[PDB]
């Protein structure tokens, strides 16, 4: 089962140096906010949480 949202979420470029904060879009319901991800080849999604998660 799933309840909580990620504490941190970023999009990054192939060099893994850019940081585009998207924590609110991932946390919000689909009808309130959304964001396009993995726009180009070798792009990244960086996600972090205070506690470990397995799904």
């Amino acid at each position: 089962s799933f309840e909580q949202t990620l504490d941190y979420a970023y999009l990054s470029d192939p060099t893994f140096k850019a940081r585009y904060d998207v924590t609110e879009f991932f946390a919000s319901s689909p009808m309130t906010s959304a964001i396009g991800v993995l726009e180009n080849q070798n792009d990244y999604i960086l996600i972090g949480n205070q506690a470990p998660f397995t799904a």
Partner: protein
Amino acid sequence: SNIKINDVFQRIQYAASAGQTQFTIPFPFFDNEYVLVWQNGVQLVMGGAPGQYGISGAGSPSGGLITLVTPAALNDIITIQGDMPIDRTSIYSATISNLTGSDLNGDFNREVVMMKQIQTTQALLQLQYAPWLEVSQDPDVTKDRYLPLLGSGQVWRMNDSGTGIEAYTIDE
């Protein structure tokens, strides 16, 4: 380090010695395809066959080298000119572009070389009035500047009224 631009024209011409194959490219360039080579007014092709040339030094801050496959004859004229497309196809993203000093250096270097190639053509290959001449300071006045197309056996001649340059037939 910056590339060699100041007072370095993007064109050079040589008078070869008998048997010479190596000719310096004295100006920076970014890609082998953006360098044009002529020999006695005939444009050459990059390759390994006789009559062709090899090239090195792309991306070098100072220039490179042209190596003819066939050794040149005495007083062959070798012309080398930089000719880069004036465009911009690598751009920054709106969201995930990390600005770097290398990025800024690359973009400014690209535009300075483009601008130098334009000014090289203007300074060495084009005609102009002397800067102190009393030409009309209004560009809309085209009396001394606009030219007509020349038909066969025609020269440019200011008309009898001094209002414009027109084509003028002169027989041979």
